Amino acid sequence: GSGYREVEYWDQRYQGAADSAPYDWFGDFSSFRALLEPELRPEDRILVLGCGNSALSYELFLGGFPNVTSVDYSSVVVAAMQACYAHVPQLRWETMDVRKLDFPSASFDVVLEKGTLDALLAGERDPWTVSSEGVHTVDQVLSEVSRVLVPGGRFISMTSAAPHFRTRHYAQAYYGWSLRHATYGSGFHFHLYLMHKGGKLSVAQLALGAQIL
Numbered sequence: 001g002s003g004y005r006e007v008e009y010w011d012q013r014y015q016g017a018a019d020s021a022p023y024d025w026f027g028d029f030s031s032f033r034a035l036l037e038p039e040l041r042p043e044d045r046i047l048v049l050g051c052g053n054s055a056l057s058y059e060l061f062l063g064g065f066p067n068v069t070s071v072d073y074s075s076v077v078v079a080a081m082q083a084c085y086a087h088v089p090q091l092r093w094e095t096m097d098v099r100k101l102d103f104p105s106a107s108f109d110v111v112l113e114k115g116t117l118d119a120l121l122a123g124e125r126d127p128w129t130v131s132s133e134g135v136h137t138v139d140q141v142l143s144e145v146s147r148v149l150v151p152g153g154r155f156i157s158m159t160s161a162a163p164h165f166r167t168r169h170y171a172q173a174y175y176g177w178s179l180r181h182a183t184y185g186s187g188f189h190f191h192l193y194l195m196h197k198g199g200k201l202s203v204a205q206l207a208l209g210a211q212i213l
């Protein structure tokens, strides 16, 4: 429900997260690595948004992608992941609201998010009609993602939201990216969106984006 929007809920959830098992929303790395890894390079500077206590950041490292930075607005979970992953100095963790990324522009080659925009859109009354706040907060995040990516960078989003709900959010021309989609995971009911800066949206995608902005 809408309680997933508030940091207090997450700070409460993540007490003791350094000692508890990792937890992954909408699949772990195994469920989508066939889709994800061909889009990555070992030298890529990767930013993971709303990391929580997911094993994704660690799995990227074990898979040959050491340049990982992970952020979350729960300072509790950031401290916990710093402690849990103290054996992996390559991995960086910082407390941050993803609506304002405190990095200089063009600092990353890839940005990933799994279940974070879902938190921003949690509890919407009508899945077909996005509230003013839902539109604005998601647009803020996406603008920041585009800003911190280098030219030519990639943003990859993993969510339970199917394209007839989520494409309208990603299909804004000013983000400066193309948009592709694949399904994965449980009953092929999870959705992976690939955005490549320098590409263009289709007229279909732009028409959906025009529905909210």
Ligand SMILES: Nc1ncnc2c1ncn2[C@@H]1O[C@H](CSCC[C@H](N)C(=O)O)[C@@H](O)[C@H]1O
Binding pocket: 005, 010, 023, 024, 025, 026, 049, 050, 051, 052, 053, 054, 056, 071, 072, 073, 074, 077, 096, 097, 098, 099, 113, 114, 115, 116, 119, 120
């Ligand atoms: N505005 C915001 N800024 C930064 N983190 C946010 C945020 N809104 C929600 N979050 C974080 O987003 C996460 C949503 S749950 C997804 C967790 C993790 N990426 C996984 O794949 O399992 C939580 O860890 C929550 O604290």
